[PDB]
Every structure is written in structure tokens, then in C-alpha cells.
Paper text:
The binding and hydrolysis of guanosine nucleotides rule the polymerization-depolymerization of tubulin through chemical-linked conformational stages. GDP-tubulin remains inactive in the cytoplasm and the GTP exchange at the exchangeable site (E) on β-tubulin activates the α/β-heterodimers, providing interacting surfaces prone to the addition onto growing bent sheets or protofilaments (PFs) at the MT end.
Before setting crystallization plates, we incubated the GDP-T2R-TTL complexes with either BeF3- or AlFx (prepared in situ from mixtures of AlCl3 and HKF2 to avoid Al precipitation) to produce GDP-T2R-TTL-BeF3- and GDP-T2R-TTL-AlFx complexes, respectively. After several attempts, we found the BeF3- and AlF3 moieties at the E-site of chains D and B, respectively. Consistent with reported GTP- and GMPCPP-bound tubulin structures, one Mg2+ ion coordinates both the β-phosphate and the BeF3- in a position clearly different than that of GDP-bound tubulin structures (~4.5 Å apart). The GDP-BeF3- complex is stabilized via hydrogen bonds and salt bridges contacts with loops T1, T4, T6 (GDP) and T3 and T4 (BeF3-). Importantly, loop T5 is in a ‘flipped-out’ conformation, leaving D179 exposed to the solvent and putting T180 closer to N101 in loop T3 in GTP-bound tubulin. Thus, our results suggest that BeF3- is a γ-phosphate analogue that mimics tubulin’s GTP-bound state in the curved conformation, and not a GDP•Pi or intermediate transition state of hydrolysis. In the presence of BeF3- GDP-tubulin activation occurred at analogue concentrations above 1 mM, suggesting a binding constant on the scale of mM. Thus, GDP-BeF3- behaves like a GTP-bound state with slower MT kinetics.
Residue numbers in the entry:
A (entry chain D): 1 to 42, 45 to 275, 286 to 360, 369 to 440
B (entry chain C): 1 to 440
C (entry chain E): 83 to 139
The structure:
């Protein structure tokens, strides 16, 4: 298993997708012309996971760019590495959902889904061994939220035995003031819970709290938030892109990280935001989490730790055992050896050492609890529905999405209270 | 004749096969291109090393081996490594998508697509044998291929070759180098379905080898290369009786008669000495008595367990190098009067001794020192059931909550297979208690 | 010697049949697993066609 097909949908999906392709491109020594100019053969070892080999030794991202608004078409191509994307993998509309989940999932989104699916198949047809899909998108918008989930369920029909990965950005009143975001988020997780295998919860409330309180940014940009997303997106995919033993492909990660098919929502962490002891405890700290969840308010089902840079593996092994035994109360005992660690020699650009954390923690319920609380504060009033009922939807979909997300929470709590 | 065919399954099995065949080539004077200038009979012959190496007209000595993995990564290194000329390409079988640490994928979904090709290539090795003795299967307990595909393979070999002997070298999982949380599952599953089809299984606890490398060889953080070069020495001691001769050489099958009192009780404990660095071996070579004493130090065992708290049903000593029976008997007498070796009351207490005079060799750039004499002890002790108990407990912790079980049901398996495999292990743990109680 | 032959042959026979059943039973379970998730995905398409047509009315 080698090739991953990447999809970016919506404003956020295309933005965080661009800076993801920018970072790993620098790590793999690839300029915007698709030419290789690195000095370690370990950069070309698994280049096929994310890059096709074109004519003349040029590397083209296996990326598909989607948006119902033709705004982002310019921005991507105008931004760095805009040419690197193949022109035909650009599929766009003219009128977007306007932050309406229904428009992106059932009407204007369903009118465009056949177009992107055609690009998915050609990109998948020439895969030696298609490994799976990863989607970048927001859950509080229209296209990435509504049409992203529809695209997942459509790809899953044609590839039911492949891994479906998503980098789902969650809404937060601290970043966006759009009122219909708790609606779009709940309807999305209702779909993600059923049709995806792995979901990295990139919580915007977390990203801002770090930029404001940690990095000391009064009015941080979307770029300041996205520099965090790019840092972690590179971290969680390190084991996929470089020769390694642990979680080297999406399925092995899934088997290691997901004990119950619905509890597949991960709490990513990153450090720094330097010695191995400090990297470890910071990596396990609440402030370094990219989801607004205190891991010590719940329990860990599984954890994947990734250290990058030149360092003593003996020290890493000792510190990972040290943090586990000193915090044993936060690791369910009915899953032995549920913390796995990987070390990559090459570090991310700008740092000597770094640590990326992927945690399946029952504390993620705090994130879903906050959304459902903001959801029920508008559903109890029956507010702003005509933007959704006017597109053909009924109350059944809203109440069913509400019930399913609250079920996810109680299931995370059911295994938090489980004993031996 | 009495040829022996080796089958290496999955990453661990393949990478251990690399270390073993390299060591074999060094021990027999075989060059990376297969040439052996000492072999004066070209194209054939019935020498002792021909149990493991066939011969071509061009003078190439070819391992009687098959390398199979459901992913090309690990075997590709064989195709381009130092010994790429040693194997004909038909011996290195690869798929394109591995089992992803899932027993179900290795035994069913993916494994069933390549099993017929593997058996066909094994058949072509068997066809060159004038008196095939049996198979040596190297695999991990925890990997999806090493567990699922091995058991599928072992089942098919029982059909295609009857009760032709099948021996295992099994890698028992350890958290220091483990790669999957579900390794307890794959271990119980593969042990249950293989138990009927295996005549003798040498378990190698990765944590035991890991500790030996850290403790005895100044390796702060042992890698698979450190572990596999130590494992190959043990495998070499065991197969040395088949690949060499000598007036005092005792055939492995003769040890096997003493080691397997009942079909299911076929898991010998291996302990190897001396594991010593060149810096410490310099100007100090260990006598026969010293390496024999080390065989009863639990820290030198291949599986973590306490034989002092169990009973012995057999004790075999496989000596290698400069060793004469006089020193052996003296060392055994010292031990029998200074160690805690209790036997079950239904089997004799004599130690079975074998000596191959061909001295052990080291792989260049290795860690262990070149010693004049080495010894591997094979003992059938009830204490090895401790290794089952540790695995069965981890299995129970996860299975009580059905954790990760959906990954197996999704591939076609049923919960019944989990409980059926677990109770086979429960009965196996119980079988080891029964053989230890005294007669009445 | 005829009993030894009968024993080995019966060991081969029953091993061949238990494996045949397992490989057939495993295929039926995996297919039913996939058949279930696809029939549940098409019902999302029936609900989608029913939604986009309910807009007109
Ligand atoms: N001693 C030793 N153990 C190994 C080696 N390689 C892997 N292992 C162990 O094997 C177990 C995992 O099985 P693998 O062999 O890596 O995987 P596999 O058999 O190829 O199965 P899949 O990858 O899922 O298809 C873990 O417990 C590892 O620690 C090795 O080279 N030497
Ligand atoms: N972190 C981050 N969040 C974003 C970005 N752009 C939009 N968002 C979030 O996404 C939500 C709006 O969704 P949007 O991207 O407009 O959906 P679209 O209609 O499919 O493009 C809001 O909650 C924003 O906070 C970005 O560049 N970075
Ligand atoms: F801005 Be999105 F298309 F709703
Ligand atoms: Ca010859
Ligand atoms: Mg937009
Ligand atoms: Mg493998």
C-alpha cells in the first residue's frame, strides 16, 4: 500500500491543504516546479505516497481541489506552489452554499459531486496500490462541510474497502461569528461518525487559544492558526511519508488507534509551540493540544507519539515510559501497551527536535459537548431552519444528527468509566 | 539427503532469515555469489550442508528457502542486498498490500490471494529433494502476515505433505519493539490454529533478546539488527546438527524425541551462552563449565519465565566448538549439585548431550565476540506456560470489551473464533499444569 | 501399518475440509459486511433524492 489521494474542499480545506502541500514539499525537497533538489535519499523513499511521477522527473501532488465558489481557484494558483497542482484537478462552481450545509450536501453540492468523482477515479485508477483518501475541510462552512461529507459517502460507495481520513476543522465563536456553524458541524459529524475511519479534530477554539495565550498574538491571522495546522498535519503524516516501522500506512494507524469503529476522532498535539524530557511532557500537556480538551478530564484509549530530529532513542523510550507510569490513571488498563512511539531522523523545517501527538481520548467529548450545546441553543428555538428546510431537508435529519452526536458522547463516557 | 526447507514469513521472518542465511554462508565458506571453493563435487553431492543448500551446475549453492511477505518492502532489500545472487528470484514471493497487523487479512482477505503461488514454489523446492525431512517456518506472532498467513500456510502444508515434520521459530511480542496493540489477538489466534499442525515450536521472546543485548553486549537501544544477529546464533546452534556431522553430533530429531512428551507439549525453552562482547572476551575465554552454568541462569533464556518455579520434562545440551565429553560431564555434575533442576516424576533426569566441533562464527561488524565454544540448551519446562499466561491475560483485558475486534469481524471472522482460540489456550495452560503434578 | 495410513489420511482429509469451510464461511461474512454498508449508503442516496425532490413541492 502506497498512494494516498488528497482532497481539499471549501475555503478552509483549500487553505490548509495548500500550506500542507507547501510544508511537506519543503521536507521532500520539491520546488514549485515539481523538481527534486534535496540531499537525502530518504526524501524520495516514499515520495509516491503523496506525489505522482510525471514526465521529466517532476513530482505532481496527488491532490484534488474543490470549492463551490470560484474564489479559491485564484488564491491557490496565486499562492506558493500554485503551479505544482495539475490544472485538471481543479473543479469549481460559481455559487456556493453560503455556509448552508444542505446546499453543499443535497443541491448545488450534489450537482458538482459527479465532476470531482471523475477526477478521483482517474487519480485512483493509476495507483499501484491505492491506500486511501484524506480530506481537508471545515465543519462550520458550506462546501467543505456539506459537500465534503457527501463526497466521503460517495467515494466510500466506490471504494468501500479503503481507508477514509479527514482533517476536520471545527467551528468556534472565538474565530468565526457565523451563526449557523453549530448546525453545520452537527450535521457533519453525523456523517463522519458513520463513513470515515480516522478524523483529526482540528479545533479552531484550540488554535486561537494557543496563538493568543501561548504565542502571545493579540489578533492572530488565519495564517497564524494555519501555521499550527500545517505543523501538526506534517507531524501526523511523518510516519506515512518516511521509511518507518510504526503506523507506516493509514490502515495500520487505524488498527492501532481505533478500538471501536465510531470512536475514531483524534486529539492531535504538537510541541514545541530543548531536551527529550521537556518535549515529552509538553507534548502531553493540555495547552499543546489542537482540540479544546483537557486530556486529564478523561482517559486515553490509544496514543501515537512521533518524535522528529536527531536524539537519543534510549532517552525517548525512557521518557515515554516515565510519562505513562506517572500518569497511569489516564490510560485505560483494558488496552495494554496502548501508547506507540516513532522516531524520524529528519526534523521539520526550523526546529532541531519536535514531537507530534495523536490521542484517542474520551476527553474529546468536551469538544462535541460544546458543539451540541451551541446546537441545542438554536434548535430549541427552531431558528434559521428555512435556509435548510428550503433546500428540501426535514426536521428528521436535524434531530437524528443531534441524537447521533449525543450518542458518540455517551459512548466516549461509557468506555471512560470501564474497568478491568 | 534428509533435506530441510526453510520458509520465512513476514518482516520478522524474512529479516531473521537474512541473518540466518548470512551466518550459514559464513559457517560453510559460501560466498555472496553462492560459490563454495571447498565443495569439490559440482552440481550435487550429499554432504551435510546439502540439507540446507542445493547446488547448480555453475557451482552455486542455493538456500532451500522461500521468502514470502504480503508487502514488497522487506523482501526488496533481499533482492538488492549483499546476498541477492544467493537466491533465485522465484524463492522471493511478495504481494503488494500487507495484512496491516490483522490476522484475518493474513489468513483470509489478502493471504488467500497468494497462498497458491507460495505452495507452488514450495512444491518446486520439495521436488529437488531426494528425501525431504521437513519444514522450518520463521514468523512473528504479532504481525498480520506472520500470524494469519503462517497458520494458513501451516494448514495447507499439513494437507499437501501429510505429517511431514514442521518446526517453527516464533517471535513472541514485546512492548519495546512491538508495532501493534492487537498483537495479543494475533498471537492467540495463530497459536490456536497452528497447534495441531506444528511438531515443535521454538519461541523467541523479543524482550528476552532485547534485555540480553542491553545487559550482555553494551547495546543502549538494540535494533532488529542487534536482535536478529543474536537470534541467528541460537537458530544456528539448533540447526548445526543437521548441517554438520561428527562422531558426537546428535541429530535434532533425536532431541525432538526427548523434547515432545505429548503432541501439544512441543514448546522447548532455549537458552544460549556465551553472549559476550569482544572487549570482555579478550584475554579471557570461557570454559565448558562456565558456559554450561550460564545455561541455567534465567537471564540467558530466549523466553522470559522462571524454570526454578516449574518442573523439567527434558534437558538437552547442544555444544559447539572446542568441547569434549569429559568437561561436559564434569560441568553437568557441578550443576546437578548446585542448581534447582526438579524433574517431573515420570521422565528420566539425564541430560542429553550433543557436540558439533565446528566452532561458532561471527558476522563481520557484529556485536558478539568470536568464541571458541558455545552451547544452546533446549529444555522442556512447564515454566514456559508463563509466556502463554502473560499473552492470555492481555487478550482477556481487550476481548472483554471487544476492543479492536471489529477490525477482524470486518474481514470475515466471527467472535466464536476468538473464544474458541482462547479456550484452546486455556486448555494448553491447563495441560502444562497437569504434566507437572506427581503421579499417584 | 494400515491403521497408520488410515490415520494420516484422515488427518489430511479433515484438515482439508475445516479449511475449506473456514475460507467459504469467511468469504460469506466479509461479503455480507460489504453488502450491508453499501445498501446503507444507497439509502442515503434515496434520502438525498427524496430531499432534493421535496424542495419543489
Ligand atoms: N526479532 C525480530 N522481531 C521483529 C522483526 N521485525 C518485526 N518484528 C516483530 O514482529 C511483530 C510484528 O510483525 P511483523 O513481522 O513486523 O509484521 P508482518 O509479519 O509483516 O505482518 P503485516 O506487516 O501486518 O503484514 C512485532 O512484535 C515486531 O516487534 C525483526 O526483524 N526481528
Ligand atoms: N483554521 C482555519 N479555519 C478556517 C479558514 N478558513 C475558514 N475557516 C473556518 O471555516 C469555517 C467557515 O467554513 P468555510 O471555509 O467558509 O466553508 P466553505 O463554504 O466550504 O468554504 C469558519 O468557522 C472558519 O473559522 C482557515 O484558513 N483556517
Ligand atoms: F463559503 Be462556503 F461555500 F459556504
Ligand atoms: Ca557438492
Ligand atoms: Mg467558501
Ligand atoms: Mg509487514
Amino acid at each position: 500500500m502506497r498512494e494516498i489521494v488528497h482532497i481539499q474542499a471549501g475555503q478552509c480545506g483549500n487553505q490548509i491543504g495548500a500550506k500542507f502541500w507547501e510544508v511537506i514539499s519543503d521536507e521532500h525537497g520539491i520546488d514549485p516546479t515539481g523538481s527534486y533538489h534535496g540531499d537525502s535519499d530518504l526524501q524520495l523513499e516514499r515520495i509516491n505516497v503523496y506525489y505522482n511521477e510525471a514526465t521529466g522527473n517532476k513530482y505532481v501532488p496527488r491532490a484534488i481541489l474543490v470549492d463551490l465558489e470560484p474564489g479559491t481557484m485564484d488564491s491557490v494558483r496565486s499562492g506558493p506552489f500554485g503551479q505544482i497542482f495539475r490544472p485538471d484537478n481543479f473543479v469549481f462552481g460559481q455559487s456556493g452554499a453560503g455556509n448552508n450545509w444542505a446546499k453543499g450536501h443535497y443541491t448545488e453540492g450534489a450537482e458538482l459531486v459527479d465532476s470531482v468523482l471523475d477526477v478521483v477515479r482517474k487519480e485512483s485508477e493509476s495507483c499501484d496500490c491505492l491506500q486511501g483518501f484524506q480530506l481537508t475541510h471545515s465543519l462550520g462552512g458550506g462546501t467543505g462541510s456539506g459537500m465534503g461529507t457527501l463526497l466521503i459517502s460517495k467515494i466510500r460507495e466506490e471504494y468501500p474497502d479503503r481507508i477514509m481520513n479527514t482533517f476536520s476543522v471545527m467551528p468556534s465563536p472565538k474565530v468565526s461569528d457565523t451563526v449557523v456553524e453549530p448546525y453545520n458541524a452537527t450535521l457533519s459529524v453525523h456523517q463522519l461518525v458513520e463513513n470515515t475511519d480516522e478524523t483529526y479534530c482540528i479545533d479552531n477554539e484550540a488554535l486561537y487559544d494557543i496563538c493568543f495565550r501561548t504565542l502571545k498574538l493579540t489578533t492572530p491571522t488565519y495564517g497564524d492558526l494555519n501555521h499550527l495546522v500545517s505543523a501538526t498535519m506534517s507531524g501526523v503524516t511523518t510516519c506515512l511519508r518516511f521509511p518507518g516501522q510504526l503506523n507506516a500506512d493509514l490502515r495500520k494507524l487505524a488498527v492501532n488507534m481505533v478500538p471501536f469503529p465510531r470512536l475514531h476522532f483524534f486529539m492531535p498535539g504538537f510541541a514545541p509551540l530543548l531536551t527529550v524530557p521537556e518535549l515529552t511532557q509538553q507534548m502531553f500537556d493540555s495547552k499543546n493540544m489542537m482540540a479544546a480538551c483537557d486530556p486529564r478530564h478523561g482517559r486515553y484509549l490509544t496514543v501515537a507519539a512521533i518524535f522528529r530530529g536527531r536524539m537519543s532513542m534510549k532517552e525517548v523510550d525512557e521518557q515515554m515510559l516515565n510519562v505513562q507510569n506517572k500518569n497511569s490513571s489516564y490510560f485505560v488498563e483494558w488496552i495494554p501497551n496502548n501508547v506507540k512511539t516513532a522516531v524520524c531522523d529528519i526534523p521539520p523545517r526550523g526546529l532541531k527536535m519536535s514531537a507530534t501527538f495523536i490521542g484517542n481520548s474520551t476527553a474529546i467529548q468536551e469538544l462535541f459537548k460544546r458543539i451540541s450545546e451551541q446546537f441545542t441553543a438554536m434548535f430549541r428555538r427552531k431558528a434559521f431552519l428555512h435556509w435548510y428546510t428550503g433546500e428540501g431537508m426535514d426536521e428528521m435529519e436535524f434531530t437524528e444528527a443531534e441524537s447521533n452526536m449525543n450518542d458518540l458522547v455517551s459512548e466516549y463516557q461509557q468506555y471512560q468509566d470501564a474497568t478491568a | 539427503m534428509r533435506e530441510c526447507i526453510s520458509i520465512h514469513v513476514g518482516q520478522a521472518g524474512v529479516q531473521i532469515g537474512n541473518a540466518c542465511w548470512e551466518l550459514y554462508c559464513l559457517e560453510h565458506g559460501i560466498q555472496p555469489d553462492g560459490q563454495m571453493p571447498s565443495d569439490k563435487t559440482i552440481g550435487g553431492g550429499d554432504d551435510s550442508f546439502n540439507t540446507f543448500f542445493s547446488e547448480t551446475g555453475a557451482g552455486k549453492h542455493v538456500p532451500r528457502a522461500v521468502f514470502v511477505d504480503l508487502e514488497p518492502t522487506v523482501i526488496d532489500e533481499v533482492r538488492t542486498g549483499t546476498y541477492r545472487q544467493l537466491f533465485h528470484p522465484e524463492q522471493l514471493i511478495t504481494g503488494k498490500e500487507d495484512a496491516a497487523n490483522n490476522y484475518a487479512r493474513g489468513h483470509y482477505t489478502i493471504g488467500k490471494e497468494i497462498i497458491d503461488l507460495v505452495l507452488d514454489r514450495i512444491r518446486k523446492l520439495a521436488d529437488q529433494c531426494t528425501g525431504l525431512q521437513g519444514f522450518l517456518v520463521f514468523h512473528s506472532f504479532g504481525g498480520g502476515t506472520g500470524s494469519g498467513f503462517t497458520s494458513l500456510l501451516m494448514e495447507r502444508l499439513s494437507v499437501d505433505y501429510g505429517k511431514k515434520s514442521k518446526l517453527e521459530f516464533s517471535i513472541y511480542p514485546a512492548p519495546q519493539v512491538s508495532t501493534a496493540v492487537v498483537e495479543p489477538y494475533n498471537s492467540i489466534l495463530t497459536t490456536h490454529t497452528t497447534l495441531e499442525h506444528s511438531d515443535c515450536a521454538f519461541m523467541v521472546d523479543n524482550e528476552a533478546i532485547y534485555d540480553i543485548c542491553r545487559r550482555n553486549l553494551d547495546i543502549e537501544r538494540p535494533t532488529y539488527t542487534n536482535l536478529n544477529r543474536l537470534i541467528s546464533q541460537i537458530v544456528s546452534s539448533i540447526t548445526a546438527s543437521l548441517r554438520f556431522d561428527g562422531a558426537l553430533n546428535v541429530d535434532l530429531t533425536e532431541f525432538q524425541t526427548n523434547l515432545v512428551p505429548y503432541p501439544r507439549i512441543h514448546f522447548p525453552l532455549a537458552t544460549y551462552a556465551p553472549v559476550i562482547s569482544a572487549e570482555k572476551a579478550y584475554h579471557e575465554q570461557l570454559s565448558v563449565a562456565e558456559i554450561t552454568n550460564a545455561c541455567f541462569e534465567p537471564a540467558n533464556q530466549m523466553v522470559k519465565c522462571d524454570p526454578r518455579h516449574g518442573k523439567y520434562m527434558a534437558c538437552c545440551l547442544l555444544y559447539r566448538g572446542d568441547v569434549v565429553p569429559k568437561d561436559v560431564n564434569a560441568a553437568i555434575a557441578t550443576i546437578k549439585t548446585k542448581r534447582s533442576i526438579q524433574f517431573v516424576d515420570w521422565c528420566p533426569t539425564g541430560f542429553k548431550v550433543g557436540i558439533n566441533y565446528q566452532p561458532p562464527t561471527v558476522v563481520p561488524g557484529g556485536d558478539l565476540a568470536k568464541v571458541q565454544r558455545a552451547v544452546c540448551m533446549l529444555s522442556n519446562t512447564t515454566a514456559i506456560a508463563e509466556a502463554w499466561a502473560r499473552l492470555d491475560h492481555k487478550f482477556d483485558l481487550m476481548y472483554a470489551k471487544r476492543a479492536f475486534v471489529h477490525w477482524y469481524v470486518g474481514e470475515g471472522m466471527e467472535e466464536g473464533e476468538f473464544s474458541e482460540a482462547r479456550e484452546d489456550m486455556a486448555a494448553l495452560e491447563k495441560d502444562y499444569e497437569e504434566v507437572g503434578v506427581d503421579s499417584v | 501399518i494400515q491403521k497408520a495410513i488410515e490415520e494420516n489420511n484422515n488427518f489430511i482429509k479433515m484438515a482439508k475440509e475445516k479449511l475449506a469451510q473456514k475460507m467459504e464461511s469467511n468469504k460469506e461474512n466479509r461479503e455480507a459486511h460489504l453488502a450491508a454498508m453499501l445498501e446503507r449508503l444507497q439509502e442515503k442516496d434515496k434520502h438525498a433524492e427524496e430531499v432534493r425532490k421535496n424542495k419543489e413541492l
